[PDB]
């Protein structure tokens, strides 16, 4: 198909935003990720949000993502440079920056 689900949208620069994917419902936890042995290892966290499937049916095996906020950008950026290509619990986690949370349009707004 047409690889480009998110086409029309506003340009938002999110550097101080840790976006991790491929997290098992078990790993997807605020306290678990906050722990100094999980993510806190890099540095103290300010905000921790968990994004997972809202409606559960039991047909396929979807994936969830977590958004961690690092008081210090430097710490965050690097934390992602090292987190990438890293094996955790047998599953290779993937961290990146520059992801959106809400939809500008939603409001409505400038629509």
From Swiss-Prot:
Domain RRM: 16-96
PTM comment text: Autoubiquitinated.
Subcellular location(s) of the protein: Cytoplasm; Nucleus
Primary role: Has E3 ubiquitin ligase activity, promoting ubiquitination and degradation of target proteins. Involved in activation of the JAK/STAT pathway. Catalyzes ubiquitination of methylated RBM15. Plays a role in quality control of translation of mitochondrial outer membrane-localized mRNA. As part of the PINK1-regulated signaling, upon mitochondria damage, ubiquitinates ABCE1 and thereby recruits autophagy receptors to the mitochondrial outer membrane to initiate mitophagy.
Assembly description: Interacts with CNOT1 via its C-terminus but does not stably associate with the CCR4-NOT complex. Interacts (via RING domain) with UBE2D2. Interacts with ABCE1, PINK1 and PELO.
The name this protein goes by in its record: CCR4-NOT transcription complex subunit 4
Originating organism: Mus musculus
Lineage: Eukaryota, Metazoa, Chordata, Craniata, Vertebrata
Gene: Cnot4
């Amino acid at each position: 198909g047409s690889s480009g689900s998110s086409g029309a949208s506003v340009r938002v620069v999110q550097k101080n935003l840790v976006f991790v994917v491929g997290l098992s419902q078990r790993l997807a936890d605020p306290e678990v990720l906050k722990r100094p042995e999980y993510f806190g290892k890099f540095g103290k966290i300010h905000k921790v949000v968990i994004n997972n499937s809202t409606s559960y049916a039991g047909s396929q095996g979807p994936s969830a993502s977590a958004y961690v906020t690092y008081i210090r950008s430097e710490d965050a950026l690097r934390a992602i440079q090292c987190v990438n290509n890293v094996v955790v619990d047998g599953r290779t986690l993937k961290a990146s920056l520059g992801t959106t949370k809400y939809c500008s349009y939603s409001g409505p707004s400038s629509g």
